[PDB]
Amino acid sequence: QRAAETYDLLKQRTEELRRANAQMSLLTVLVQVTQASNSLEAILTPIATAFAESFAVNACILQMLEGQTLSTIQGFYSQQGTVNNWLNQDPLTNEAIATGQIQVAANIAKDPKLASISQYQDNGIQSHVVIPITYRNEMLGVLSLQWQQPISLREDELTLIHLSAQLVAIALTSSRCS
Amino acid sequence: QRAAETYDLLKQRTEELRRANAQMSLLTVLVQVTQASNSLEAILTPIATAFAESFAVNACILQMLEGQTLSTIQGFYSQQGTVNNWLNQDPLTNEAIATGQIQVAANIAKDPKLASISQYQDNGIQSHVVIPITYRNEMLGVLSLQWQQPISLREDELTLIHLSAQLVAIALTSSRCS
Numbered sequence: 268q269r270a271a272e273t274y275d276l277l278k279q280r281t282e283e284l285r286r287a288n289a290q291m292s293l294l295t296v297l298v299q300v301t302q303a304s305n306s307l308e309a310i311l312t313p314i315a316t317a318f319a320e321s322f323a324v325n326a327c328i329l330q331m332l333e334g335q336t337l338s339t340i341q342g343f344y345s346q347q348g349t350v351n352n353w354l355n356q357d358p359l360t361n362e363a364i365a366t367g368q369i370q371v372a373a374n375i376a377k378d379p380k381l382a383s384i385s386q387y388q389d390n391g392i393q394s395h396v397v398i399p400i401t402y403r404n405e406m407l408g409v410l411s412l413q414w415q416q417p418i419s420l421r422e423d424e425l426t427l428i429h430l431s432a433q434l435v436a437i438a439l440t441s442s443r444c445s
Numbered sequence: 446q447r448a449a450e451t452y453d454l455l456k457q458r459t460e461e462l463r464r465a466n467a468q469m470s471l472l473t474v475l476v477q478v479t480q481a482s483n484s485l486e487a488i489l490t491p492i493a494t495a496f497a498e499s500f501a502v503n504a505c506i507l508q509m510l511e512g513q514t515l516s517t518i519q520g521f522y523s524q525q526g527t528v529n530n531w532l533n534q535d536p537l538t539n540e541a542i543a544t545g546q547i548q549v550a551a552n553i554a555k556d557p558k559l560a561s562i563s564q565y566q567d568n569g570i571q572s573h574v575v576i577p578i579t580y581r582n583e584m585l586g587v588l589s590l591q592w593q594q595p596i597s598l599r600e601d602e603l604t605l606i607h608l609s610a611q612l613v614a615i616a617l618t619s620s621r622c623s
Contacts, residue, residue, distance in 0.1 A: 287469060294608075
């Protein structure tokens with residue numbers, strides 16, 4: 268009966284509601300973190316951590332740029348006992364820096380330009396998204412999201428990444444104000 | 446039957462979903478506007494306009510501060526044929542500047558400190574919210590929301606105002622970067 272296709276539509280709304288709330292929650296935390304810090308360095312790990320929890324990553328790295336080189340300045344989170352930063356050796360990151368575009372590798376085994384990279388293999392990284400962090404046209408850094416399984420991002424998750432990163436860029440650019 | 450108390454809960458979820466989407470939408474527009482501008486002055490009206498549409502105001506004013514004086518620098522929106530800025534003569538605004546707190550006057554006729562003010566009367570303003578716009582502890586300006594009817598803000602609407610304003614403060618502080 269059409270009263271069973273109402274369980275199909277409440278179960279649908281609630282999931283959408285759940286999703287929308289989780290989006291709001293990430294944006295809320297990013298604003299809070301920005302307001303509570305007093306320097307750029309204090310803000311980095313908290314931001315990485317915020318993305319890590321939102322996207323259930325194995326690891327997240329937020330790394331600053333000087334021109335088009337990765338800075339030593341960075342913040343990070345990992346479920347592992349150590350964070351292994353090999354982004355300077357990463358084709359995916361290198362394409363992000365060059366093109367100013369989000370780069371999505373949903374399944375490493377399939378990008379042949381990525382499948383044979385020792386670092387992806389030894390860290391067990393099977394999906395990777397890297398997004399430049401750009402304020403106006405100034406690229407301030409990159410944010411890397413890493414998982415040990417292949418992912419399949421929804422439309423809403425990609426919108427959230429685009430907006431998130433954009434907010435983060437507003438955030439970093441203000442943090443440099445003494 | 447309990448199948449009629451499922452229409453009561455889908456009609457409930459959808460409204461909550463509607464609300465959450467409208468929140469996301471305001472935050473999205475504020476980020477976009479910040480990224481698309483190239484100066485602080487270009488950003489002001491768009492931000493005021495964004496709040497005006499979100500909160501269905503009669504008018505919105507976003508006005509910069511120098512120390513604790515209102516600047517000439519400002520942006521605004523109004524349904525009226527003219528924007529009448531009388532915030533320098535406003536006790537509500539003056540309390541916001543002094544206390545760094547949101548000020549809510551849901552029904553002017555009832556604040557006796559506000560009911561006899563010529564400007565509230567002649568503009569037909571029956572409710573008024575003014576929120577300082579503060580980055581870290583630096584108060585950059587005030588944002589004023591004005592209606593011709595009494596309002597009754599929901600919990601979610603107040604959270605949105607707090608976060609919004611906080612984002613705007615991040616936004617203005619970055620805009621000053623040449």
